[PDB]
Design a protein around this nucleic acid. Structure first.
Ligand SMILES: [Mg+2]
Ligand SMILES: [Mg+2]
Ligand SMILES: [Mg+2]
Ligand SMILES: [Mg+2]
Ligand SMILES: [Mg+2]
Ligand SMILES: [Mg+2]
Ligand SMILES: [Mg+2]
Ligand SMILES: [Mg+2]
Ligand SMILES: [Mg+2]
Ligand SMILES: [Mg+2]
Ligand SMILES: [Mg+2]
Ligand SMILES: [Mg+2]
Ligand SMILES: [Mg+2]
Ligand SMILES: [Mg+2]
Ligand SMILES: [Mg+2]
Ligand SMILES: [Mg+2]
Ligand SMILES: [Mg+2]
Ligand SMILES: [Mg+2]
Ligand SMILES: [Mg+2]
Ligand SMILES: [Mg+2]
Ligand SMILES: [Mg+2]
Ligand SMILES: [Mg+2]
Ligand SMILES: [Mg+2]
Ligand SMILES: [Mg+2]
Ligand SMILES: [Mg+2]
Ligand SMILES: [Mg+2]
Ligand SMILES: [Mg+2]
Ligand SMILES: [Mg+2]
Ligand SMILES: [Mg+2]
Ligand SMILES: [Mg+2]
Ligand SMILES: [Mg+2]
Ligand SMILES: [Mg+2]
Ligand SMILES: [Mg+2]
Ligand SMILES: [Mg+2]
Ligand SMILES: [Mg+2]
Ligand SMILES: [Mg+2]
Ligand SMILES: [Mg+2]
Ligand SMILES: [Mg+2]
Ligand SMILES: [Mg+2]
Ligand SMILES: [Mg+2]
Ligand SMILES: [Mg+2]
Ligand SMILES: [Mg+2]
Ligand SMILES: [Mg+2]
Ligand SMILES: [Mg+2]
Ligand SMILES: [Mg+2]
Ligand SMILES: [Mg+2]
Ligand SMILES: [Mg+2]
Ligand SMILES: [Mg+2]
Ligand SMILES: [Mg+2]
Ligand SMILES: [Mg+2]
Ligand SMILES: [Mg+2]
Ligand SMILES: [Mg+2]
Ligand SMILES: [Mg+2]
Ligand SMILES: [Mg+2]
Ligand SMILES: [Mg+2]
Lengths: 126, 18, 46, 110, 102, 56
RNA sequence: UCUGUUUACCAGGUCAGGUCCGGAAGGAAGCAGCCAAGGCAGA
RNA sequence: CCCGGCGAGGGGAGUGAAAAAGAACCUGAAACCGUGUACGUACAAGCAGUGGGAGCACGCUGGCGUGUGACUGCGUACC
RNA sequence: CGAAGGUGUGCUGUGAGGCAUGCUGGAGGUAUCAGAAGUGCGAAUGCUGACAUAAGUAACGAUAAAGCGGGUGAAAAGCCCGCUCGCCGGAAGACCAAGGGUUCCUGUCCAACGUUAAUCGGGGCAGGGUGAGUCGACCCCUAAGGCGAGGCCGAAAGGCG
């Protein structure tokens, strides 16, 4: 299936090619609903991302749900960073694992057609 | 291609708005 | 078994429907009492 | 040093959960985890989750060692009960209590 | 007929910030004002990736009652009280102690 | 047929004396996997009396 | 005692990546991978 | 930040004079239901108390308070 | 420098009571002498609310019936997929009117609802879906019957036509 080794590969392949002005322009469908400026700083987020993924042992990378409080302490200590960044990175891998399972079960055109952008009420951003 | 662009788009992109 | 209320819209309306109340003196008095008691709906319509 | 955990509003009677919660009163938390594991009950599961939780609390919040712990206080109170209605023969309706319960576990090293 | 208005320099009469001085940022219809550097609250925010806000404890200025602030007369160096008079055809504000126009 | 007077909490306690569970005392530790488990039941890993009898 | 393989952080060494100090020179704590090493085995 | 199911529920941190003010939110009584501690109870018959009364526990400074109440006299709720 | 209330304890009166103080509580109380009462609760098969009891008992709604492998998943007797098995078959199938009103389909969610569990649903939230010259209504026409210009009838309203 999908692992943080496969996310390691997706990430050292994506930190090579990627930019935030070539990625926020290839879509004008979610550059109208979300602010055109909310992309990221790609170099920093993918260098932190590759740092945090590299700090992992091979059994924590191949199986991402065995990572708990002590392991996040240690991933924060080896890459010299915050337990909160490690947290929200295990959370983005959680969502993209969710989405590659939803591309796996349903066809590429049914999981690209039923994808939804939302407003809590129809007024802009509110 | 098809799964390269559907990976890459929803990945960088849905990394962004959530 | 066969219970009392067997619904039919037509019957419902020709009987207690608004115009059927606008038929008679006592219809119009029921409507008065109803507005005076500040009823949400006077008759059954829709 | 005491460390607490509470599950509040668990669906179970107080009375059904007590039956389980009594097996582990006083034990060394290891042994407790096991007794709960091979106990066949729903309350078994509730109580166990609360217990493990309390141990996590002790260790992360208070830095207390898991091997030293005992279960010093454990008790179950009667939470807010949601009323319902079960309809009966001859049209007499009968109000139902779906009971909740408050499971409190308190562990300490000493 | 608003005694305290935007951009005035006020002094805080009451509360933790009593004695302090500052410039009025805006007023709310509740008879409340928001003063600069005054009445600072530490507010926790849950990070919004839609608004590109991080989370955290961020210090913001809280609404304070307008009964609790006085127009500051820098002339007398004290808290003052406003009154309205008619100069030209225009209603204007003046101080009650030395009786001169704001 | 229904009770004439309210049975007291004392009574109600007495009746429930016997409804106490019995703890499971014996935890068998396997030779190979060193897992605890009920006697005569296979482990979580499908180990029994030294063997892996179930790959599961 | 050779070889087969196992053991996240909280025994050791190398410590990539990344991160701290410095304008720069360079250091530094150290996660992973590897080797000790500790489990379990072929002899 | 930590357990948990990307829960419910919790425990930390922080805000605040106060979080036994946490949105199931002021005060939080009684019935009711528990956990801990003291004494009592498995040869004993009844409106369960009252008169007496050992022993034990706990407070005091060898005496007094409090809790309990083995045993015995009398004793068939209120309206 | 801690009111009302709440809750212990101590003292005091012949009683209904009073006084003092520990904790709780966090802003109101009120002497004295008068005045006026929605002025005192255990009963009324009293009223409303709350919580006991029987009891963790009776019951889980047709005796058509299940079993196994695999999937997902925190967890699978119930979900999905496969192989069997069993039931209806003038219905327990298919298509409408009546009535309902979104229950339809897709994602998504598991607190409450489902007499159990639930990853499932006619449950929750979001989106999507209903295409007519010839189908039906609307319309053309009358039945029973209704309403009824004038008109007759009637204290009044109204009755008949
Ligand atoms: Mg009908
Ligand atoms: Mg009925
Ligand atoms: Mg009788
Ligand atoms: Mg029993
Ligand atoms: Mg929470
Ligand atoms: Mg503070
Ligand atoms: Mg307080
Ligand atoms: Mg409550
Ligand atoms: Mg207040
Ligand atoms: Mg309260
Ligand atoms: Mg209370
Ligand atoms: Mg109470
Ligand atoms: Mg004898
Ligand atoms: Mg005896
Ligand atoms: Mg007897
Ligand atoms: Mg006596
Ligand atoms: Mg003593
Ligand atoms: Mg004494
Ligand atoms: Mg006696
Ligand atoms: Mg006698
Ligand atoms: Mg007082
Ligand atoms: Mg009063
Ligand atoms: Mg008081
Ligand atoms: Mg006090
Ligand atoms: Mg008081
Ligand atoms: Mg207080
Ligand atoms: Mg007075
Ligand atoms: Mg008074
Ligand atoms: Mg008087
Ligand atoms: Mg009265
Ligand atoms: Mg009486
Ligand atoms: Mg009765
Ligand atoms: Mg109420
Ligand atoms: Mg019961
Ligand atoms: Mg029985
Ligand atoms: Mg029986
Ligand atoms: Mg029956
Ligand atoms: Mg039965
Ligand atoms: Mg059934
Ligand atoms: Mg199966
Ligand atoms: Mg569940
Ligand atoms: Mg299965
Ligand atoms: Mg079945
Ligand atoms: Mg099947
Ligand atoms: Mg047949
Ligand atoms: Mg219809
Ligand atoms: Mg609906
Ligand atoms: Mg459906
Ligand atoms: Mg259920
Ligand atoms: Mg669905
Ligand atoms: Mg639905
Ligand atoms: Mg036709
Ligand atoms: Mg006709
Ligand atoms: Mg006429
Ligand atoms: Mg007529």
């Amino acid at each position: 299936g999908f692992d943080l080794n496969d996310f390691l590969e997706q990430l050292r392949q994506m930190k090579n090619m990627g930019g935030x002005x070539x990625x926020x322009x290839x879509x004008x469908x979610x550059x109208x609903x979300x602010x055109x400026x909310x992309x990221x700083x790609d170099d920093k987020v993918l260098v932190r991302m590759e740092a945090i993924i590299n700090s992992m042992t091979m059994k924590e990378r191949a199986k991402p749900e065995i990572i708990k409080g002590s392991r996040k302490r240690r991933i924060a200590a080896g890459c010299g960073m915050q337990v909160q960044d490690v947290n929200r990175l295990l959370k983005q891998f959680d969502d993209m694992q969710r989405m590659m399972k939803k591309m796996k079960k349903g066809g590429x055109x049914x999981x690209x057609x039923x994808x939804x952008x939302x407003x809590x009420x129809x007024x802009x951003x509110x | 291609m098809k799964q390269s662009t559907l990976a890459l788009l929803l990945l960088l992109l849905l990394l962004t708005p959530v | 078994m066969k219970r009392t209320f067997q619904p039919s819209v037509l019957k419902r309306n020709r009987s207690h429907g608004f115009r059927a109340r606008m038929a008679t003196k006592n219809g119009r008095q029921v409507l008065a009492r109803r507005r005076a008691k500040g009823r949400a709906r006077l008759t059954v319509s829709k | 040093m005491e460390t607490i955990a509470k599950h509040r509003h668990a669906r179970s009677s107080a009375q059904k959960v007590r039956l389980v919660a009594d097996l582990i009163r006083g034990k060394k938390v290891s042994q407790a985890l096991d007794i709960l594991t091979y106990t066949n009950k729903k309350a078994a599961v509730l109580v166990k989750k609360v217990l493990e939780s309390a141990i996590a609390n002790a260790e992360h919040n208070d830095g207390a060692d898991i091997d030293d712990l005992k279960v010093t206080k454990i008790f179950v109170d009667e939470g807010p009960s949601m009323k319902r209605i079960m309809p009966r023969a001859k049209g007499r309706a009968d109000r139902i209590l779906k009971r909740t319960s408050h499971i409190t576990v308190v562990v300490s090293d000493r | 007929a608003a005694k305290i208005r935007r951009d005035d320099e006020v002094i805080v009469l009451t509360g933790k910030d009593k004695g302090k001085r500052g410039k009025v940022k805006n007023v709310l219809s509740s008879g409340k004002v928001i003063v600069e550097g005054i009445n600072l609250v530490k507010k926790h925010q849950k990070p919004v990736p839609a608004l590109n806000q991080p989370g955290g404890i961020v210090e913001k200025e809280a609404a304070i009652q307008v009964s609790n602030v006085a127009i500051f007369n820098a002339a007398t160096g004290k808290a003052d009280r406003v009154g309205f008079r008619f100069e030209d055809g225009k209603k204007v504000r003046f101080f009650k102690s030395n009786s001169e126009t704001i | 047929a229904v009770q004439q007077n309210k049975p007291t909490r004392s009574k109600r306690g007495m009746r429930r004396s016997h409804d106490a569970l019995t703890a499971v005392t014996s935890l068998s530790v396997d030779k190979t996997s060193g897992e605890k488990h009920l006697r005569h039941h296979i482990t979580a890993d499908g180990y029994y009396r030294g063997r892996k009898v179930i790959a599961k």
